[PDB]
Design a protein around this ligand. Structure first.
Ligand SMILES: O=c1[nH]cnc2c1ncn2[C@@H]1O[C@H](CO)[C@@H](O)[C@H]1O
Ligand SMILES: O=c1[nH]cnc2c1ncn2[C@@H]1O[C@H](CO)[C@@H](O)[C@H]1O
Ligand SMILES: O=c1[nH]cnc2c1ncn2[C@@H]1O[C@H](CO)[C@@H](O)[C@H]1O
Ligand SMILES: O=c1[nH]cnc2c1ncn2[C@@H]1O[C@H](CO)[C@@H](O)[C@H]1O
Ligand SMILES: O=c1[nH]cnc2c1ncn2[C@@H]1O[C@H](CO)[C@@H](O)[C@H]1O
Ligand SMILES: O=c1[nH]cnc2c1ncn2[C@@H]1O[C@H](CO)[C@@H](O)[C@H]1O
Lengths: 233, 233, 233, 233, 233, 233
């Protein structure tokens, strides 16, 4: 496809979608066997390998609705992918949400115009595939993680001048901010395939608490495991 | 409160919310013991009774976002209600969704302006309480119902001149149309309480299939049972 | 029709539209002769009778744009109704407007999306039928009421978190808030029939003054009389 | 003021507002006695004189919401004007509306953003002063004109690429298109003064019928008379 | 055309567009030879003459997007005009912008709805013809003027209740406010012809500094010269 | 900063901004001397080196408004960058625009919501720094390139279901589609620094013509040269 140099059949039907291509590399090296790298266009690494015997892929998406939309469209339309699980990080916008929690997004709010253009006059609420959601929830519960299932904000702006609306969304139960889920969930629904986002809380936007990769790695490793499990089912 | 004549403490913390007040009467008479009627203002019947030993209420809401918003605000703010389960009907907008299916709404799309006013420039995706959702899903699964968990449209207009956008929403996986869920889910989130909508598919909007109350009553009875169960937990 | 169980011909061509079905009952019992009840679906009472010798009907609408839109569509499209007069209550948003005033709405502002969906990019100003308006004005003037003719707000939300915009509308001459007129006037215009809203001011939103039904009943009775008069002409 | 060179007190409290400054000149010369010209800034002629003994003014506004808004703000805020009557022309968008009809605008629809900016999320329906409206209606009725009272479109674009929405507005009872009323009515309401628009239908937009000034002059003269009458009361 | 009484061929292919028709008269009398007046409809003077031997026209537009849109549509579509240069005034909204500066608009922001209607869901950025822009820039540079090339605001409202957004636009580099450029640039682009706006700063909106025509006339004369030069090339 | 691991002072005040980090590597290796790599976070390579003796940097941005906004905010606010030139590719949406043309964006249209959120009710037209624009134009003219200066579309969606609006924008003179310029120009203006986008046309969206990197490399090399030149001045 335009942004992926893989041949037909090189990408598995189940795929993990980190935003960072170097995290795709880490996931492939850490968890998968019999690994090939099928893409390095724009440095946006993608790999296929085996986990507990099943083929699976892992593909960086880049940051933001427009970037992930490019990759998700191509994966679905050109490579026949069926199950797509974003594995990422997010910033908590509730005191009750803690750094190192794992959030499974039921749905996402957004300040993107992508869906207002598609459905003029409507608020489109992009939804997770429930069967994948339940599988990940059950796997994370059994893995012993603090799993929260709820709403997130998919933001176009990482650096927002006023935080008033983000605070207000938090007061309406929105758990955390990230930059991709609306697009993944909307496009998967469009094409009749299955999507989920599973996120590690890496910082709290209003307390200023933050972590490096190393400082959240055990939780992050465990989260990848339950994303892979929800994939291989 | 302005629209409910009950005294403080007459309404239980868990409540079922049919749109039709005569369905509230049917539910109270059919399922509950030790029943009182606490409201007849505007004919919008409300009852409290016991089911398998636990107090519970049932309150008509009327039709549409503005009507249910009035009742939900008053129930939460004046009567201290904690768990709110809409029990209603809907029209399928997918061929794969069948009349007599039970839909549990994860989230809702809308053509209402209610949330655009509250969050200018954003698409707010109103979400179910996951713990209530899981309890209802498990109860309906065990009850032997065809349960579908997904997205619905909360419409302001029952009679829409063009169906183009409703068809398009169906192509993006939206299961059915109804007229209340956005408001229930948004207000419950605002106030930190727990909401869910559990709906019986009564007609298919694009095939013209339809049912009377009697023609869907066994399914509807079973749905009330699993809404009550998710309530008494 | 879907929400009205009347046979063809049971509903008169001229109809009064209170929001409260129990007010429809009161109006029929108090003012009409030879009364039949033609509907009790959803408890949304409707009656036909005679006033000073002419057939007329009275039909509850419920609260809010979506509810009244259902009834008005069915009345016009399935029952051939020609003259529709909402008879209701409202909350004043001007100090100069007094409780027990009667407001005849020339037009209505709204926070509903109903017309933005129909006319993308435009502000649709829903207008009263002038001939009905003049007849009601003349009848109320002769009846000795304080009649104010002007603009109202048709609100989707009864409980608004911030009142800033309602105050601002008051500063631009908007007289009172209610929850139905935009829909009645828009739909009547769509179908080429005649509509009017005639409202009793029951409270002042910024002074906190309020009334019970009994405390405004003489004014309310007189208002029904001039709505009926504007109907029988 | 910035756009009017008159001294304080040179402009009467009642004023007619044609769009064309040469029509202001015609009105002053044809109907008024003891006439002064108080403005020629930008060629936007304004005059004060006497009609049946009462002082009155007549001021061109130019075409479009932004132009008339400039003049109306200055007249109200700098010159203390109290009663403002636009006297203009319009294009019919209904077959039932005829060239040479006089339309008295109850309210106006618009494709302008002026009110969406002022009232975010709301549709503001700009309304005529009813007392002035009734006075003009009664005067036109007695004068023997075909007077229509209803809704108009205030357009930003005279040359619209697609007429679909103008046709649709006609199907919802909107009588004619012009380019000023929304602004006049909104600003008068803002400042607590009295406004009305009284328009001669000069063309039918969908039949192509049209008139020159001379071809509608008797009707136009009669309309000025009843605008002046509604002014001097 | 509807608003211009000229015969075919009476208007030159290159035209200057002041807002004030009396400025069109001043420009023709001051700079042109062999002058004819081809229009006085609505007092909106238009002239054709010769400058340094080349035919050119000058046409008042009136104030605001709707007024200039009428004239620009007719000039382009009925009179075959090819090069259109608005010559006007503006109010500075930056301290760094000085009264008597000449601004050449690259593009324009707006609070008009004109382009949102044409391109639903998009922000259309109306752009100058670069070749004309460069010619005017070079001519003004050589003439010894303080020329600033940048962004302006095309406003619908001259009298804005809150200046917050105008201040904010200034903080994003917008130089000045005027009332026509969006429309000129958009329509010229639509029809494949060449437009530019060249403006004299006449006042500073936040310091209150202001000028009369006489007080900026030398600069204004020099600006007309470089607009004419960019025209005759 | 959060997404760039460079120390203070490692990034030059003038910077080129390709979307593809591997193009940043190519630019540094091909054109610069004394090169350091200061960033590999997320694989988003950034380099500093010397060109004709002046320090300069080159930093990948990723694809889309949200991605480039992250990098541009950090470069400006944390690293003190002053001159930012996007060097990228685009798809032509005019027949008159040819593959291998170089477009210098004066301004950009968008379907992003980023500026509607910042300036509610307004169309913000993001503008290039004119001084940088002129320097690049002059350099490209002297280099012998086909340089077009005009408007572009900054799109959120690479894969758009309907092309109707893109075609319409082309009919209004918009030259090409890309995915970053609105954000670069808006943020540079916010912070008072200088930005430009210089793009090679790599494909024609409506003819299907396309190129590989190798097939446009001579033009692309020449474009980098004139972006660097406009930088070192
Ligand atoms: O606090 C946050 N705000 C926005 N995005 C975040 C946050 N935390 C993690 N991400 C995620 O990391 C990238 C941006 O750095 C995006 O991919 C986003 O989804
Ligand atoms: O097909 C449908 N469209 C809209 N609402 C429906 C449909 N089916 C059931 N409801 C539900 O019944 C009432 C309206 O009659 C509303 O309360 C709505 O939620
Ligand atoms: O102050 C008010 N706000 C909103 N609606 C009102 C008010 N007063 C009367 N109504 C009317 O009563 C119902 C809501 O209780 C609605 O039908 C509305 O039209
Ligand atoms: O058909 C019409 N469309 C738009 N405006 C019209 C029409 N007829 C009359 N006017 C009026 O004349 C000026 C424009 O020529 C505007 O002032 C408008 O109000
Ligand atoms: O400060 C200003 N605000 C708005 N428009 C201005 C300003 N200065 C000059 N103009 C210009 O003059 C007319 C309005 O008086 C308009 O044509 C506008 O473009
Ligand atoms: O035809 C096009 N549409 C959208 N973006 C394009 C096109 N051609 C080049 N780009 C540019 O390349 C990346 C997307 O592949 C984006 O960075 C965009 O700016």
């Amino acid at each position: 496809s335009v942004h992926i140099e893989a041949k037909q059949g090189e990408i598995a039907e189940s795929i993990l979608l980190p935003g960072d291509p170097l995290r795709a590399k880490y996931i492939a090296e850490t968890f998968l066997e019999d690994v090939t790298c099928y893409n390095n266009v724009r440095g946006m690494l993608g790999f296929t390998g085996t986990y507990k015997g099943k083929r699976v892929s892992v593909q960086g998406t880049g940051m933001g609705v427009p970037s992930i939309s490019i990759y998700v469209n191509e994966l679905i339309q050109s490579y026949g992918v069926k199950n797509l699980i974003r594995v990422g990080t997010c910033g908590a916008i509730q005191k009750d949400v803690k750094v190192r929690d794992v959030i499974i997004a039921m749905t996402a709010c957004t300040d993107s115009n992508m869906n207002r253009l598609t459905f003029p006059g409507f608020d489109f609420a992009p939804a997770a595939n429930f069967d994948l959601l339940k599988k990940a929830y059950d796997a994370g519960t059994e893995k012993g993680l603090h799993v929260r299932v709820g709403n997130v904000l998919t933001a176009d702006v990482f650096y927002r001048e006023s935080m008033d609306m983000v605070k207000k969304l938090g007061d309406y139960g929105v758990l955390a901010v990230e930059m991709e889920t609306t697009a993944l969930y909307t496009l998967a629904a469009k094409y009749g395939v299955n999507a989920l986002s599973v996120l590690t809380v890496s910082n709290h936007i209003f307390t200023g608490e933050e972590t490096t990769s190393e400082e959240r790695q055990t939780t992050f490793n465990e989260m990848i495991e339950i994303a892979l499990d929800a994939a291989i089912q």
